[model samples]
Target: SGGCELTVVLQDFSAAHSSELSIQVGQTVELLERPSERPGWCLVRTTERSPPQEGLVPSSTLCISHS
Candidate 1:
């Protein structure tokens, strides 16, 4: 509710830890939430997957657009 609903993956990211999300360039995702305490991370869900997968991804890896 507090974050934007759309973002574009700018770079490919492989989960470095279990809590991270693996993403590829050109993929669209939903920004579920922002971790205010964690400066560069955001909670997101991949839009291309069925029952979209959710996990944490670096904010720099995405191009977030406000709506």
Candidate 2:
């Protein structure tokens, strides 16, 4: 089966977890944004590492934007 794109909206855009993310539920998080709080901030893109995967192959971004 192929993959699916997803979007996770955060209620708070504080500096605490602005660029960081904790995958409690969901995979390949597309973007996490709220109102002025998280305006253009997004929780980077992370790929599915599956099992026994390591290195840069399993890394995401902490994309934050405001304009």
Candidate 3:
């Protein structure tokens, strides 16, 4: 289908991987990969940060906001 919605980081991701994202709690990010698009993990980008970081974060780590 199309793309997934934006999400918030719920926990700190401190590991290192090729698709890893250095994100902190409460930061907002855009979900590039939804579970329907890809499972378990998601490709994401920082929403408000300058030159936004692009990488992957666990789908579980993101919060589904109510809009």
Candidate 4:
């Protein structure tokens, strides 16, 4: 699926998948997957860091963007 960019906040998150992926307030991420029929989680990677470590973040905390 085509993805978009987003700026998200760190609050409640799941560590059940990958421990390396974490979120914090003021965090910026690029969407690897967007919320669809998929339920509450979205795949993203930290935009502020390199070698991008991807993570799953709650859709509620994400602020969508374009361009």
The model with the greatest lDDT is 1
Per-residue lDDT over 1-67 for candidate 1, one digit per residue giving the tens place of the 0 to 100 score: 4555777677788776665678888878887776466676666576578866776677778765333
Give the Å error, residue 16, model 2: 11
Whole-structure CA lDDT of model 1: 0.69
- By lDDT, the better pick of 3 and 4 is 3
- Writing each residue's lDDT as its tens digit, candidate 4 over 1-67 gives 4665665754645445753366665667776776664666566676567766677766665554322
Q: Count the backbone clashes (under 3 Å) in each candidate.
A: 0, 1, 0, 0
**Candidate 1 runs further than 4 Å off:** 1-4, 16-19, 65-67
Candidate 4 collision pairs:
none
Candidate 2, TM-score vs. the true structure? 0.22
Q: What TM-score does each of the candidates earn?
A: 0.64, 0.22, 0.64, 0.60
* lDDT of candidate model 2 versus the reference: 0.34
Please report the TM-score between candidate 4 and the true structure: 0.60
Go through the candidates in order and give the C-alpha RMSD of each one to the true structure.
3.4, 11.2, 3.8, 4.2
Writing each residue's lDDT as its tens digit, candidate 2 over 1-67 gives 2332344333322223335544432334554332244343344344454431111111123222345
Candidate 3 TM-score versus the reference: 0.64
Q: Which window of ten consecutive residues has the lowest lDDT sum in model 4?
A: 58-67
The local lDDT score (0 to 100) that residue 63 gets in candidate 1 is 67
